[PDB]
C-alpha cells in the first residue's frame, strides 16, 4: 500500500457546507502536500507542509485551509463549498522539504461530491443478467452480465464473486459509469460488467455467482427525512446459481 | 518543464517506450515519472538524473543530453494502461503534474466472432478496429482470461421501451 492514509473514503455534502479532509502521512516523512483533481482539471497542486510549516503555495482558494499537526499528519478545510469544488483530493508525503532526490507517495484519497440537495443520493439497483443460449451454442462460453443502476454519485465499486471466492480473472467493467438523464445536472449513474466464464462451467449448478456493488452513499452523521430509506454507504448484491 | 505525446497506444506484451522531452535546462532537476491508474490515485514510477536507472516498475533511459528521456514498461499488459506523467523535481510551486501521456493497450484477438446476443443485449468478439437518447450503451471493455489465454472485446446495450440495432457479418439468433 501507498504508506500515506487518508479520511474519509467518501464524502457528500449540501453546497456552501464546511468538510475538514484528515491525512496521516508515510510515517517516516516531514512533508504532506494536497492535490486536487476534477475532470476538467487534472492534477492540480493544492499546498505542502514541511516539518509544521507551511512551505509550497498553490491554488487553495481562499475557502481552503491547511494545516500539519506536531504529529505530520495534516487536515484540510474546504469552507462554503462550490458544486465546482467536487474534485478528488489527494494528500501526499516525502522525506525532505524538496521532492527532488527523495520521492513523493500519495494516499488513496478522498472524493468530495458537493451537491445541490442530498435527495439527489441514490443506492443503486443491481441485476445480474445470465448469459444467453445462443452464445453457448455459437461461441462454446458463457457470458454473465451485471447491470448496477440508478445511483448517485457514482461511488460505485463492482466485485465478482464465484463459489464464495472473489475472481479477478474473467471480469470486465466500464471505468465510466453511463449517466441516465445525460441533460439533467445532477443525473443517476448506471454501471454493466461482464464475467464470462466456460460454457461447461455454467452449466455447472454447484457454482455460484454474486455480483457485488458497493455504494459510498451518505453518513450515518446526516439529517434524514425522507419517507424511502435512506441512501446510506451500503453493499447492494445479486447471486445468480448455474443453470444446467 | 516538460512535455510528452497526450495519447499513445501500444500492444499487450512489448516494451513500451514512454517519450519525454525537457530541452528547458534539466539541471540538478531530477526526470521524475508517476502513473494513474483507471479510478485511482497518482503512484510513483521511476525517477533518474545523469544515468539510466533501474527498479521493479520500470526502466528509465535518460539522453546523454538529457534534453528527453524515456519511460520503458519492460513489458506492458491491459493493467499497464494508465496515465503517465514526465515530471522535473530539484530544490525548494513546482510539485505539479502535467498533461501526461493516456497510455491505452489493446490484446491480441486472434479470432474476432462479432455476434450481438440477448442477455438487455450484449455485444461482444469484435476487432479494436471498431469502437461504439431513449437506450443506454456501454463503452467496449476488455476481459482476458487466465487458463485460456483468450481476452475478449465487449460492450453492453439496454433500453426501456426489444433488441435493436446498436460491426461486420455479427450474428443475430432467431
Ligand atoms: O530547431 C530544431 C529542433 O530540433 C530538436 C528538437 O528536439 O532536435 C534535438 O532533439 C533532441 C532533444 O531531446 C536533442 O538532444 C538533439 O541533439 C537534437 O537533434 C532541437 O535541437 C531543436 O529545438
Known amino acids: 500500500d501507498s504508506g500515506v492514509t487518508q479520511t474519509p473514503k467518501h464524502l457528500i455534502t449540501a453546497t456552501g457546507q464546511r468538510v475538514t479532509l484528515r491525512c496521516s502521512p508515510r510515517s517516516g516523512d516531514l512533508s504532506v502536500y494536497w492535490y486536487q483533481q476534477s475532470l476538467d482539471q487534472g492534477l492540480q497542486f493544492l499546498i505542502q507542509?514541511?516539518?509544521?510549516?507551511?512551505?509550497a503555495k498553490g491554488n487553495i482558494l481562499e475557502r481552503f485551509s491547511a494545516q500539519q499537526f506536531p504529529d505530520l499528519h495534516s487536515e484540510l478545510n474546504l469552507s462554503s463549498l462550490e458544486l465546482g469544488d467536487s474534485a478528488l483530493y489527494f494528500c501526499?508525503?516525502?522525506?525532505?522539504?524538496?521532492?527532488?532526490?527523495?520521492?513523493?507517495?500519495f494516499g488513496p484519497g478522498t472524493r468530495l461530491t458537493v451537491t445541490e440537495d442530498l435527495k439527489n443520493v441514490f443506492p443503486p439497483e443491481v441485476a445480474v443478467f445470465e448469459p444467453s443460449e445462443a452464445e453457448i451454442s455459437h461461441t462454446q462460453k458463457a457470458t454473465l452480465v451485471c447491470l448496477a443502476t440508478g445511483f448517485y454519485p457514482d461511488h460505485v465499486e463492482l466485485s465478482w464473486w464465484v463459489n464464495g471466492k472473489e475472481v479477478h480473472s474473467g471480469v470486465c467493467t466500464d471505468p465510466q459509469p453511463l449517466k441516465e438523464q445525460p441533460a439533467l445536472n445532477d443525473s443517476r449513474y448506471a454501471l454493466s460488467s461482464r464475467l464470462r466464464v466456460s460454457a461447461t462451467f455454467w452449466q455447472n449448478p454447484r457454482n455460484h455467482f454474486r455480483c457485488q456493488v458497493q455504494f459510498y452513499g451518505l453518513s450515518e452523521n446526516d439529517e434524514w427525512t425522507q419517507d424511502r430509506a435512506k441512501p446510506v454507504t451500503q453493499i447492494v448484491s445479486a447471486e445468480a446459481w448455474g443453470r444446467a | 518543464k516538460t512535455t510528452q505525446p497526450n495519447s499513445m497506444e501500444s500492444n499487450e506484451e512489448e516494451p513500451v517506450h514512454l517519450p519525454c522531452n525537457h530541452s528547458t535546462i534539466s539541471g540538478t532537476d531530477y526526470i521524475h515519472w508517476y502513473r494513474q491508474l483507471p479510478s485511482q490515485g497518482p503512484e510513483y514510477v521511476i525517477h533518474?538524473?545523469?544515468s539510466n536507472v533501474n527498479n521493479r516498475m520500470a526502466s528509465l533511459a535518460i539522453a546523454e543530453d538529457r534534453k528527453s528521456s524515456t519511460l520503458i514498461l519492460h513489458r506492458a499488459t491491459l493493467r499497464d494502461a494508465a496515465v503517465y506523467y514526465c515530471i522535473l523535481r530539484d530544490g525548494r510551486d513546482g510539485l505539479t503534474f502535467g498533461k501526461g501521456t493516456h497510455l491505452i493497450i489493446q490484446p491480441y484477438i486472434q479470432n474476432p466472432d462479432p455476434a450481438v446476443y440477448q442477455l438487455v443485449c450484449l455485444f461482444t468478439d469484435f476487432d479494436s478496429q471498431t469502437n461504439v437518447s431513449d437506450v443506454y450503451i456501454t463503452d467496449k471493455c476488455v476481459l482476458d482470461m487466465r487458463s485460456m489465454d483468450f481476452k475478449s472485446n465487449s460492450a453492453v446495450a439496454w433500453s426501456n421501451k426489444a433488441c435493436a440495432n446498436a460491426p461486420e457479418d455479427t450474428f443475430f439468433p432467431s
Open positions: 507542509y514541511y516539518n509544521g510549516e507551511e512551505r
Open positions: 533518474g538524473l545523469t
Open positions: 501526499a508525503s516525502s522525506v525532505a522539504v524538496s521532492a527532488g532526490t527523495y520521492e513523493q507517495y
